[PDB]
């Protein structure tokens with residue numbers, strides 16, 4: 001079934017990864033170097049063996065696609081994926097007068113008091129970003145994130161390059177190009193980033209009037225992260241195909257470090273005992289073609305009928 | 317046997333690639349997205365089913381490793397891999413007074429007269445680079461090539477970053493890093509390069525005191541190119557391991573477009589009828605550890621006993 005390579009990656013890490021106690025005090029199982037395809041003509045790979053929220057994934061890809069780096073657009077779709085990194089900024093600023101919120105990463109997952117003055121300051125933070133333009137401009141804006149990496153990569157000559165729109169125009173004029181590459185990885189920023197990008201670069205390819213894409217993902221959370229990563233790039237592959245008048249081919253997912261936090265063993269095992277369902281179907285608005293000016297309503301999921309969601313603690 | 321994944325890639329493209337008539341008037345068979353490992357503890361992957369010149373490959377990696385971008389170092393080891401791109405520069409300059417040498421790519425492979433005034437100007441060109449310092453500085457120097465990408469990546473703030481030496485020091489201090497990445501791909505240069513790099517980026521990983529490396533190669537000549545590419549990165553993986561006091565793990569080779577020019581079908585088939593031999597062994601100078609100051613004599617191949625070389629026309 002469409003999603004099986006996903007369940008094969010999980011199983012593979014379960015009985016072959018090594019214990020590697022990295023970035024934290026937790027531990028992981030880990031493999032290095034893996035690859036899996038999905039034939040996108042067979043259906044859209046949104047995992048049916050567990051409920052994944054499509055709205056979150058599409059509202060974030062559009063954000064990237066408009067080249068936007070400000071959280072406000074996300075909060076306006078009840079998308080909180082990125083609040084942490086913005087709010088963190090806030091928290092170490094001079095204009096900040098409140099509970100010291102040092103290491104709320106862990107601290108809001110132990111202390112259950114703390115973790116309530118935490119959705120305190122956040123709800124308060126998010127709200128100001130929604131309403132106060134200058135605050136939004138000051139702390140709502142991440143700076144180095146996919147949207148500006150893809151569409152506004154800073155040159156040294158001090159201009160700004162739109163890799164993604166240049167590449168798309170290359171696909172129309174020279175589809176047989178072996179050079180259709182978008183990279184999110186700038187070595188002059190990379191050492192001072194709180195998150196050097198996980199999705200490092202991708203490559204398009206066309207043959208027989210079909211578009212494929214291959215993603216090199218440097219580091220991957222098999223349980224929480226990869227389910228999302230997959231639908232995100234398979235969606236991009238549909239948008240680009242749609243804009244270039246092309247058919248859709250495969251999405252190829254290549255990994256460097258792929259891991260499973262040990263706090264997730266039970267949850268992944270439960271999942272591995274479910275039987276995939278037939279995959280959902282994507283539907284794009286046939287009248288609109290300029291994919292940079294796409295809206296939520298222009299992208300539809302059909303026949304998604306997952307098993308229930310699986311709550312699981314996030315990585316500390 | 318060690319080299320089999322190489323023969324499996326060939327076979328795979330032979331009976332599954334599609335005809336794609338790209339960059340030229342020739343044609344190729346093509347697949348997109350492939351991956352293969354080599355367990356470097358089982359021996360060094362220099363193809364035994366055909367004679368590959370190790371001297372060429374090591375003298376070029378050292379060049380990259382010293383961060384050098386001038387051909388002269390290569391010519392001093394009878395390494396001509398890169399003459400073309402240098403000489404091309406020469407040929408369109410004002411100081412050039414000679415036969416017009418337009419499109420000597422093809423032109424020296426049809427005309428057999430031309431192709432003799434061609435090793436004329438070249439032998440003449442190479443010689444001046446060897447002897448005339450200022451000429452060497454003017455036309456011997458490529459500019460954007462792996463050596464300066466790896467070790468002298470230009471910032472916009474106008475400095476110069478040594479990604480490779482920074483990463484190596486990260487491996488010593490933080491081997492469990494999921495961030496050990498060197499990229500050769502600058503989007504502000506990429507559109508004005510005669511050859512946007514084929515070897516796009518690589519990633520190191522350590523576990524159980526073993527070093528692995530994974531290479532994302534965007535575009536690959538299965539017959540002429542890939543045999544070299546493989547020994548080049550498996551060598552890098554040994555050098556770095558040796559410098560960091562580590563054991564050697566696997567070399568993982570990931571491809572985007574992997575192709576076979578149609579002019580190579582017979583030659584690859586002949587090769588596929590030979591039976592691999594036991595692989596050779598690498599030997600590094602145990603006393604010297606600073607790998608940036610390695611010399612030819614510090615790296616030895618043992619027990620390489622290939623089948624004969626296979627002449628084949630280059631791609632036009």
Ligand SMILES: O=c1ccn([C@H]2C[C@H](O)[C@@H](COP(=O)(O)O)O2)c(=O)[nH]1
Nearest residue numbers: 023198219220221222225226229494
């Ligand atoms: O979309 C995403 C974003 C992040 N990660 C995770 C995996 C790692 O736990 C973390 C990166 O930590 P470092 O890899 O940068 O050390 O990001 C994913 O799997 N998918």
Ligand SMILES: O=c1ccn([C@H]2C[C@H](O)[C@@H](COP(=O)(O)O)O2)c(=O)[nH]1
Nearest residue numbers: 178339514535536537538541542545
């Ligand atoms: O070490 C190398 C260098 C080059 N190539 C080839 C494959 C392609 O024929 C060519 C690149 O042409 P474009 O891919 O840039 O279009 O480089 C290799 O396979 N290995």
